[PDB]
Coordinates of C-alpha atoms in Angstrom, one line a residue:
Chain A
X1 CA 0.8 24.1 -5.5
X2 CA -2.5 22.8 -5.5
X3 CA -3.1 19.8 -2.5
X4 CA -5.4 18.0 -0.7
X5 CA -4.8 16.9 3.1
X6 CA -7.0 14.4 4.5
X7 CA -7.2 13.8 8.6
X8 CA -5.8 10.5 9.7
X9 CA -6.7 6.9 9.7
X10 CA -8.5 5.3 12.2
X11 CA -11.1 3.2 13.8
X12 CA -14.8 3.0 13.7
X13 CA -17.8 0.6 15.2
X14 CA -19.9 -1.0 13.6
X15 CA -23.3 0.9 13.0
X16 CA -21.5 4.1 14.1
X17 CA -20.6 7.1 11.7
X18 CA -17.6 8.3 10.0
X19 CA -16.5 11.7 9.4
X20 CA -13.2 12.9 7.8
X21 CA -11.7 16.5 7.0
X22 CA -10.4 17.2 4.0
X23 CA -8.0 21.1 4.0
X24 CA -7.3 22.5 0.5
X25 CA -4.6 24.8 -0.8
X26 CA -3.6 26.2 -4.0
X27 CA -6.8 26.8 -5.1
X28 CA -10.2 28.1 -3.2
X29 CA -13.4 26.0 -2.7
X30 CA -15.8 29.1 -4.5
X31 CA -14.2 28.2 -7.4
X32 CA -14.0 24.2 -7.5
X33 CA -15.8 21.3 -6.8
X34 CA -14.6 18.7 -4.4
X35 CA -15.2 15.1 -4.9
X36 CA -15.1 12.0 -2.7
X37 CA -14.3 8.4 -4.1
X38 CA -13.5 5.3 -2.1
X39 CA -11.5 2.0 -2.9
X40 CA -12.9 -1.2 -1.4
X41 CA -11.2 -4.7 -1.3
X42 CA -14.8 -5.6 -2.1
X43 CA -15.9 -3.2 -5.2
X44 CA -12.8 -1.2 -5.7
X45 CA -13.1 2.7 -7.3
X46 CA -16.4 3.9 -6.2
X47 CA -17.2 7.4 -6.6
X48 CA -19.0 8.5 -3.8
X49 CA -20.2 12.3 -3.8
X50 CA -19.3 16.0 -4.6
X51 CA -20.3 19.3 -2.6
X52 CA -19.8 22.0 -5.7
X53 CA -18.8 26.1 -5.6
X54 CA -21.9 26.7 -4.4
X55 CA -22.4 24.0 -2.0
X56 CA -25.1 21.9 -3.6
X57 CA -24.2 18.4 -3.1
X58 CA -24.4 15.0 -5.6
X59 CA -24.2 11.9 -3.9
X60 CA -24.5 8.4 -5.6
X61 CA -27.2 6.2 -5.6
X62 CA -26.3 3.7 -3.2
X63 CA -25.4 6.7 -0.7
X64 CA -28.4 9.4 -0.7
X65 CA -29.7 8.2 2.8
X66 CA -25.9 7.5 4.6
X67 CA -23.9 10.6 3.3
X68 CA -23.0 14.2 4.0
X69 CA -21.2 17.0 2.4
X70 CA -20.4 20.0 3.7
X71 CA -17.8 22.7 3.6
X72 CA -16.4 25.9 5.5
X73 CA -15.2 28.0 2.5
X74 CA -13.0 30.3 4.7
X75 CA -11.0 27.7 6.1
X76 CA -10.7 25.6 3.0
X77 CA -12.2 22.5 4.7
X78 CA -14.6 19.8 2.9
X79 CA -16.3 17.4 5.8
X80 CA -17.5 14.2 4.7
X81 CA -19.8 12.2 6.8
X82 CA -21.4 8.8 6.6
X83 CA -24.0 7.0 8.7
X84 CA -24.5 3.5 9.6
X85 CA -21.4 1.5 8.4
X86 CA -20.6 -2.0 8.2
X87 CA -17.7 -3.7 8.0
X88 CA -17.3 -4.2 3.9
X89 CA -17.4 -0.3 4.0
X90 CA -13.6 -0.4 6.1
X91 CA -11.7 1.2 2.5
X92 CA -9.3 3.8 1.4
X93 CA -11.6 7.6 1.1
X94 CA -9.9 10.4 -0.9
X95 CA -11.2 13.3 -1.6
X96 CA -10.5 14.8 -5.0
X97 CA -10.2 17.7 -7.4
X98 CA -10.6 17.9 -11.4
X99 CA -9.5 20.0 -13.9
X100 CA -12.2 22.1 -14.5
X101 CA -14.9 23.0 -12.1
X102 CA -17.9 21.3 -13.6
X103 CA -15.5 18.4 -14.7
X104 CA -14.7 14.8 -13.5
X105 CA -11.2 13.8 -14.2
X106 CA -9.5 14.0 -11.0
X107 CA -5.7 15.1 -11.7
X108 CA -5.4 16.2 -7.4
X109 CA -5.6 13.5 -5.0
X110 CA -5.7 13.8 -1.1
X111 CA -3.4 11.0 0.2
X112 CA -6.5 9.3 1.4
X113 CA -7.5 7.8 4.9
X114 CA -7.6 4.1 5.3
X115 CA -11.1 4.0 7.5
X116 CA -11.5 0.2 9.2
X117 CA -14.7 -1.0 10.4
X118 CA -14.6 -3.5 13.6
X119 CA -16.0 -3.8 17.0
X120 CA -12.4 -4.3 18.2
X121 CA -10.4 -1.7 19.8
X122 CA -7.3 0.3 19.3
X123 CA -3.9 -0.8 20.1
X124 CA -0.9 0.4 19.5
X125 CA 2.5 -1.4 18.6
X126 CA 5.3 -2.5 20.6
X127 CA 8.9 -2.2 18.7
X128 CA 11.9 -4.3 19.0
X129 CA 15.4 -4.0 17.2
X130 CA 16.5 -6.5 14.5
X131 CA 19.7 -6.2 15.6
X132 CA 22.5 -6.2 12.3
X133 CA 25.3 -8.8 13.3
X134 CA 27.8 -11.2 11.5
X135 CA 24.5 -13.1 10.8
X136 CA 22.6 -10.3 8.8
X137 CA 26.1 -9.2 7.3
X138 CA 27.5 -10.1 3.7
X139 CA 29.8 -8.7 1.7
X140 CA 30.3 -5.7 3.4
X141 CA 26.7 -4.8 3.7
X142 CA 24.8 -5.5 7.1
X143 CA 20.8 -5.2 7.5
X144 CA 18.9 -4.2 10.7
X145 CA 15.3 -3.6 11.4
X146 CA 12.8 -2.8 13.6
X147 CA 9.4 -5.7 14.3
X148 CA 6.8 -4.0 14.7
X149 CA 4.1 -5.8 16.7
X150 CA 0.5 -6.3 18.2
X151 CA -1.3 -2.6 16.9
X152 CA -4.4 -2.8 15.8
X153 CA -6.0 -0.9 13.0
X154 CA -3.6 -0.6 9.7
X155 CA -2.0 1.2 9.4
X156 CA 1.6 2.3 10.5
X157 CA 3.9 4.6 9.1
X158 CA 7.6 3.9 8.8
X159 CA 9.8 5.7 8.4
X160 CA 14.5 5.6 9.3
X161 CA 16.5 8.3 10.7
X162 CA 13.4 10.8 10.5
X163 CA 13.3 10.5 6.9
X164 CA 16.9 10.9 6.0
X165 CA 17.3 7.0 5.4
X166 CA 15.1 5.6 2.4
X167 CA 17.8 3.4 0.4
X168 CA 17.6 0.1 0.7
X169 CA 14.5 0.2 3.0
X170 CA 11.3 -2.7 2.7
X171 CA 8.9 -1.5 4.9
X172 CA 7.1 -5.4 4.6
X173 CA 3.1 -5.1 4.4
X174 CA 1.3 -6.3 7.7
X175 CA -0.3 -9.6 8.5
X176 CA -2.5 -9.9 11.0
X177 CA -2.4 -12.4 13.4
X178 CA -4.4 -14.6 15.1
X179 CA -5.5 -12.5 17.7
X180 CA -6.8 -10.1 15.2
X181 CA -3.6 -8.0 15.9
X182 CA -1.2 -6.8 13.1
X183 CA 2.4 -7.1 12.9
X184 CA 5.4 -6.0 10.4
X185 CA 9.0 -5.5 9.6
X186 CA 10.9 -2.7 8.8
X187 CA 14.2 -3.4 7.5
X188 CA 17.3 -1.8 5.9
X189 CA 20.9 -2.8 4.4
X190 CA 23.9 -0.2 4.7
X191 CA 27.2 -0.4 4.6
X192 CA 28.9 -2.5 8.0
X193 CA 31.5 -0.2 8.6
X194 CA 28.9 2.7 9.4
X195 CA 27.4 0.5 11.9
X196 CA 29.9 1.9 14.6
X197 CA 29.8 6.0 13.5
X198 CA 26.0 5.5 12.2
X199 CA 22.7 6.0 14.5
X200 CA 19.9 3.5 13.0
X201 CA 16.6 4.9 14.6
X202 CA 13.2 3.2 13.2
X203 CA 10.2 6.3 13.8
X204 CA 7.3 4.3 14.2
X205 CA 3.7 6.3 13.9
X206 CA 0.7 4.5 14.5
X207 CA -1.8 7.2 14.0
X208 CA -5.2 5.1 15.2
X209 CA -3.2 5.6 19.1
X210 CA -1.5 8.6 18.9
X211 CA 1.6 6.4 19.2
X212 CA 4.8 7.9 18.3
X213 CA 7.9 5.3 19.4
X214 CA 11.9 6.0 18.5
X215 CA 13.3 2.9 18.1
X216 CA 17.4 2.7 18.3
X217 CA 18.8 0.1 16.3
X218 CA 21.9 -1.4 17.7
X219 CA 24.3 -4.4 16.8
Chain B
X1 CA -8.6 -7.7 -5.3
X2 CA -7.8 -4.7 -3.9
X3 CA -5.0 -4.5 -0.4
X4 CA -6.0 -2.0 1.6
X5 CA -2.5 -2.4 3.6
X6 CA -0.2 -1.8 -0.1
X7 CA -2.9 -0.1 -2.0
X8 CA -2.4 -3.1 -5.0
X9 CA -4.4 -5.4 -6.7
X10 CA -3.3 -8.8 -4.9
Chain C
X1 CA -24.4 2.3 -14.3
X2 CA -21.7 1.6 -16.6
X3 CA -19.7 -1.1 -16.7
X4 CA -16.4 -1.2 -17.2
X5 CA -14.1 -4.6 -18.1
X6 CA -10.5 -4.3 -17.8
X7 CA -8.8 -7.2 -19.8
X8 CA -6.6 -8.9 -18.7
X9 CA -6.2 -8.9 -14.9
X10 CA -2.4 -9.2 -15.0
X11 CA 0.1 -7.9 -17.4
X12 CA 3.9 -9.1 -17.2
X13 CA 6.4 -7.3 -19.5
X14 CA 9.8 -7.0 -19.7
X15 CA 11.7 -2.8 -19.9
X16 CA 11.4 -1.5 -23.3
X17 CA 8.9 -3.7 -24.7
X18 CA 5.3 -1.7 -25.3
X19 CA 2.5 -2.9 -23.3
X20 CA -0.9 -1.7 -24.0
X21 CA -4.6 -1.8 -21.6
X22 CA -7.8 -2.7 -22.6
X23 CA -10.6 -1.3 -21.1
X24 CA -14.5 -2.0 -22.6
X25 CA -17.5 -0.2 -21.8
X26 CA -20.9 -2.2 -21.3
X27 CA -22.6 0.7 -23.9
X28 CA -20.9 3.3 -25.8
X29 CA -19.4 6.3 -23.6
X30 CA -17.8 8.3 -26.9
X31 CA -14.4 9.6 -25.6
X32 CA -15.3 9.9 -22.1
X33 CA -12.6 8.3 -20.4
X34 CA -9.9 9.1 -18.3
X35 CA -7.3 6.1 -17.6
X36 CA -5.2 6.3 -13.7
X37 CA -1.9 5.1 -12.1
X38 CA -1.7 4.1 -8.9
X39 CA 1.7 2.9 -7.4
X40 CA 2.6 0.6 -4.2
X41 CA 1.0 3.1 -0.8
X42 CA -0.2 5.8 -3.4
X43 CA -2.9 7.6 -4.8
X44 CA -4.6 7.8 -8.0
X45 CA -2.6 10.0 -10.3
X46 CA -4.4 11.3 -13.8
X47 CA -2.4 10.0 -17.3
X48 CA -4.5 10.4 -20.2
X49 CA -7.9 12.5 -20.2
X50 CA -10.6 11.9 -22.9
X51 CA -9.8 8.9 -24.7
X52 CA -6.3 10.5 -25.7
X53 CA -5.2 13.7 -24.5
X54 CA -2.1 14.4 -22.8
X55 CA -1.8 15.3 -19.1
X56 CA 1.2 17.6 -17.4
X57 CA 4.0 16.1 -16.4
X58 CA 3.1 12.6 -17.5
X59 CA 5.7 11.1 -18.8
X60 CA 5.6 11.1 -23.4
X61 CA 5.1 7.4 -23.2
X62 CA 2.0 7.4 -22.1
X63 CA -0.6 7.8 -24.8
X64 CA -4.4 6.5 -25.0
X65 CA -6.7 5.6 -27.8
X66 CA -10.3 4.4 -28.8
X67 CA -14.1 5.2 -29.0
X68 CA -16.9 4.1 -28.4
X69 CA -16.9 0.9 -26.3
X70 CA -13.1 0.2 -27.1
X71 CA -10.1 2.1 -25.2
X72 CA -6.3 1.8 -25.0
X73 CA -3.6 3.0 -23.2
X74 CA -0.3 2.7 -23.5
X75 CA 3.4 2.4 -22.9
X76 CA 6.0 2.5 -26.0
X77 CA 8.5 1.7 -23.7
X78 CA 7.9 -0.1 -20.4
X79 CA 10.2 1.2 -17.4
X80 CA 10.6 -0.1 -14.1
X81 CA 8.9 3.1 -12.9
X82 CA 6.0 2.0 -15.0
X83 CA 5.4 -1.1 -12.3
X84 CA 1.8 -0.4 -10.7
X85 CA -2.0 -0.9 -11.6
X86 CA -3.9 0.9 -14.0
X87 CA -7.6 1.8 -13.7
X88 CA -10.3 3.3 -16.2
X89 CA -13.0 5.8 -15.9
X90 CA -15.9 6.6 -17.8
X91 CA -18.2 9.7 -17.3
X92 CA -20.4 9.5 -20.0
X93 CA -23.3 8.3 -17.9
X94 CA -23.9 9.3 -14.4
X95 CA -22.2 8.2 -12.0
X96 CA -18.8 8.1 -13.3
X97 CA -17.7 4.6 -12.8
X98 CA -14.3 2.5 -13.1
X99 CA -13.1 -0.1 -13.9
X100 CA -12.0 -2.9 -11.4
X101 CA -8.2 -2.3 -13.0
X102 CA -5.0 -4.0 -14.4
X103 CA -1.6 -4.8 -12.7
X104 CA 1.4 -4.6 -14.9
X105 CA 4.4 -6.8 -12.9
X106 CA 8.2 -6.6 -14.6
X107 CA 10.1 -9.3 -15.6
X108 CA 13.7 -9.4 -15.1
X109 CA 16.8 -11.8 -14.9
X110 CA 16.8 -14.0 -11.8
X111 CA 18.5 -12.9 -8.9
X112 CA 19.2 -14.9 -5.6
X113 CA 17.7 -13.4 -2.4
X114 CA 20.2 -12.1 0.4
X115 CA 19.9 -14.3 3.4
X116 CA 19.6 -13.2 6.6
X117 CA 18.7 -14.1 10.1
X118 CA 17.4 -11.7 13.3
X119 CA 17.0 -13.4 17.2
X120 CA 14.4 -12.3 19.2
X121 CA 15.3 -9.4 21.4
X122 CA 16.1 -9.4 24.9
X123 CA 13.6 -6.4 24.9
X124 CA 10.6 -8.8 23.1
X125 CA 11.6 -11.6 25.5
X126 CA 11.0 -9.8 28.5
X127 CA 7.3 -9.9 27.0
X128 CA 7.6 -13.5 27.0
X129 CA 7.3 -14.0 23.4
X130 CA 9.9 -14.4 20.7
X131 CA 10.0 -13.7 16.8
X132 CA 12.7 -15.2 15.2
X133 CA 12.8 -13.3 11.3
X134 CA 14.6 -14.6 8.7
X135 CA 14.9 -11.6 5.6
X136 CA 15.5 -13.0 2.0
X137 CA 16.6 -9.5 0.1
X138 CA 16.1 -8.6 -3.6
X139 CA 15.5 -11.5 -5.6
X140 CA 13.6 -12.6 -8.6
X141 CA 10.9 -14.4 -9.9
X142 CA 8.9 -13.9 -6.4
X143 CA 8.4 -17.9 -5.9
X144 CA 10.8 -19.0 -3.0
X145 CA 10.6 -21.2 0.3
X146 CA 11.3 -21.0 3.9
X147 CA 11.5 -23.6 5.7
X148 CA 12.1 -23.3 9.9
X149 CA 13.7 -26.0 12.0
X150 CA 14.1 -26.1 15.8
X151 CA 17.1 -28.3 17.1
X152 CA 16.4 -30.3 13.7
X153 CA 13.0 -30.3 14.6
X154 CA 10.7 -29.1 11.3
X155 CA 8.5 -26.0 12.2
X156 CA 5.0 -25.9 10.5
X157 CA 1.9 -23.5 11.4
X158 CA 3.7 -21.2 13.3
X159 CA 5.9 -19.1 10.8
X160 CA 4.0 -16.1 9.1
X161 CA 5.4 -14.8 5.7
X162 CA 5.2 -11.3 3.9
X163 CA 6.6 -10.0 0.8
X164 CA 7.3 -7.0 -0.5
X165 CA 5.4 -4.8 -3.8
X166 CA 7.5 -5.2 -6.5
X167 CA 10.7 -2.7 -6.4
X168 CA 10.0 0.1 -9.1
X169 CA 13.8 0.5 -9.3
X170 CA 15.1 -3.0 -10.1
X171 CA 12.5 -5.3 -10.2
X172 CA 13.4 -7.3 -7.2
X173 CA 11.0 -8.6 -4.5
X174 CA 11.5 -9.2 -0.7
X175 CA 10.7 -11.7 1.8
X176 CA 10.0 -11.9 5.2
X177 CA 9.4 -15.3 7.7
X178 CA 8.9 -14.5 11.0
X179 CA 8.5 -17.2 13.3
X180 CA 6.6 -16.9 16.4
X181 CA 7.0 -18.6 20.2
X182 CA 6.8 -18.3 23.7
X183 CA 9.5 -17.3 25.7
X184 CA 9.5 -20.7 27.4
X185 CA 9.8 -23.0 24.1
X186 CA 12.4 -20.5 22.9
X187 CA 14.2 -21.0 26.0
X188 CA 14.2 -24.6 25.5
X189 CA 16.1 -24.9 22.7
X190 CA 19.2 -24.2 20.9
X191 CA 19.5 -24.0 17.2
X192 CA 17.6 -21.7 15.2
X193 CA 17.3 -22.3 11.5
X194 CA 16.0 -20.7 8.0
X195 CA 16.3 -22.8 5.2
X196 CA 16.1 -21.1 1.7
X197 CA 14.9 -22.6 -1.4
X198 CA 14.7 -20.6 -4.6
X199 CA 15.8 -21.0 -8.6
X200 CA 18.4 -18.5 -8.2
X201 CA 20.4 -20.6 -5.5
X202 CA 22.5 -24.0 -6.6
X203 CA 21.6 -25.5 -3.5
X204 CA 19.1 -24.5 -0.2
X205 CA 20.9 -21.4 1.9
X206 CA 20.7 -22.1 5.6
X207 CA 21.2 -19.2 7.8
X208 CA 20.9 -20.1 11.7
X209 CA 22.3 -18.9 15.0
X210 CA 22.3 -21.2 18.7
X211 CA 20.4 -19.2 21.5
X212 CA 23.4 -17.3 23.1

């Protein structure tokens, strides 16, 4: 099918430059233009730019002197660049795909790249058990967790028994802390009688640090 | 306004 | 540019019930206008193209109308599913613009929250800091207090809360207070306790433990 696959998430200085990759399939790039749109706490959907077919480039306004499109047609990869960023510019970029070539109504999505802008540095998390006990059991059903703690940029992805576990799961949004460090909760309910036949394993992925962490739940 | 951590209007 | 006014900010229906979105354009922009979906962690995903025309594999409920500086989409028959926000786009007029979006919320019948109560671990006090959660599961409306007490001592300032997007399969929200000390207070102490107001309960819900 047709998809777009954006590279990860991550930090970026102040002043300094961003630059994401953006690998198609399903389709080729000498036959459709790719677009890039951004969604800001600040000004929300923003379209950004497009390199077309035949690699001309459009870029908005606001963006002429700070932006870059480019493309390697033989590996399906679009490269976005931008210069100079501030803070306010920390949003979500997709890249995008329309219908038609020449057209604007995006019906293919990359899962976009949640880019922060800070002077701060990368951290990644530490994770400890929410241990399920008599005191997180009722009725039968007992919930567990993991807290993940002290990483720094968003985000983090979540996910129980590599994937096989998604009932009953709130992955809670993070807040950040005082010391300008983010923290969350994972947690799921399941049945307390599986709790001693049952493996609980949080997989915690901070991207930003290359940190991968396997957290064993246990009551 | 837009949250960047849930991708919803807050 | 074009500028696009999405009206109102917040919709809140309850399943079944048709709901419609308004979007207005600052000048006319014909039937040049595509309207999007975007659920909780997602992307943008294409309903309607054009004012009105139909999109594969979205859903027969979704349809769209209007011209001009007037547009319209809508559900016949709100679903659960259906829970996200809803942007506009017109590209009559370079750039193509959008509009700054509605969020449609479900109502439902209330439900009490699930109570329940994590220690720090062994693992985080070794750190020398301890988090203390206390996890109020699936309950409606989302208004609900936590209140944290230390040997009947009332905590304030240094609890942080966090609740989940709205469940797209039954409506419910979820709740997290996490409170937050050094290994040494935590140490000093013996009972740890959530309190639990919320119009689903007869009376508060106190879930606590004593240090060992």
């Amino acid at each position: 099918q047709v998809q777009l696959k954006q590279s990860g998430p991550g930090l970026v200085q102040p002043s300094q430059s961003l630059s994401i990759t953006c690998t198609v399939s399903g389709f080729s790039l000498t036959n459709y233009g790719v677009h890039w749109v951004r969604q800001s706490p600040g000004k929300g959907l923003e379209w950004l730019g497009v390199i077309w077919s035949g690699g001309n480039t459009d870029y908005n306004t606001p963006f002429t002197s700070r932006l870059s499109i480019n493309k390697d047609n033989s590996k399906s990869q679009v490269f976005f660049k931008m210069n100079s960023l501030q803070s306010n510019d920390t949003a979500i970029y997709y890249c995008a795909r329309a219908l038609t070539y020449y057209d604007y109504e995006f019906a293919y999505w990359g899962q976009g790249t949640l880019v922060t802008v800070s002077a701060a540095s990368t951290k990644g998390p530490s994770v400890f058990p929410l241990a399920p006990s008599s005191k997180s059991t009722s009725g039968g059903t007992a919930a567990l967790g993991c807290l993940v703690k002290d990483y720094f940029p968003e985000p983090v992805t979540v996910s129980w028994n590599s994937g096989a576990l998604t009932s009953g799961v709130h992955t809670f949004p993070a807040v950040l802390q005082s010391s300008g460090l983010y923290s969350l909760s994972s947690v799921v309910t399941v049945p307390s009688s599986s709790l001693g036949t049952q493996t609980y394993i949080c997989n915690v992925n901070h991207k930003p640090s290359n940190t991968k962490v396997d957290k064993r739940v246990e009551p | 306004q837009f949250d960047l951590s849930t991708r919803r209007l807050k | 540019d074009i500028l696009l006014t999405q009206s109102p900010v917040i919709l809140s229906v309850s399943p079944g019930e048709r709901v419609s979105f308004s979007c207005r354009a600052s000048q006319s922009i014909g039937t040049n206008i595509h309207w999007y979906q975007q659920r909780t962690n997602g992307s943008p995903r294409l309903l309607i193209k054009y004012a009105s025309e139909s999109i594969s594999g979205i859903p027969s409920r979704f349809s769209g109308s209007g011209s001009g500086t007037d547009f319209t989409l809508s559900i016949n028959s709100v679903e659960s599913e259906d829970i996200a926000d809803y942007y506009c786009q017109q590209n009559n007029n370079w750039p193509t613009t959008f509009g700054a979006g509605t969020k449609l919320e479900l109502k439902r019948t209330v439900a009490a929250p699930s109570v329940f109560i994590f220690p720090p671990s062994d693992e985080q006090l070794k750190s020398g800091t301890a988090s203390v959660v206390c996890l109020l599961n699936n309950f409606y409306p989302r208004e609900a207090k936590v209140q944290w007490k230390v040997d009947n001592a009332l905590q304030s300032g240094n609890s942080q809360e966090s609740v989940t997007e709205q469940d797209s399969k039954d409506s419910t929200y979820s709740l997290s207070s996490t409170l937050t000390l050094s290994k040494a207070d935590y140490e000093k102490h013996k009972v740890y306790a959530c309190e639990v107001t919320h119009q689903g309960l007869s009376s508060p819900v106190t879930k606590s433990f004593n240090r060992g």
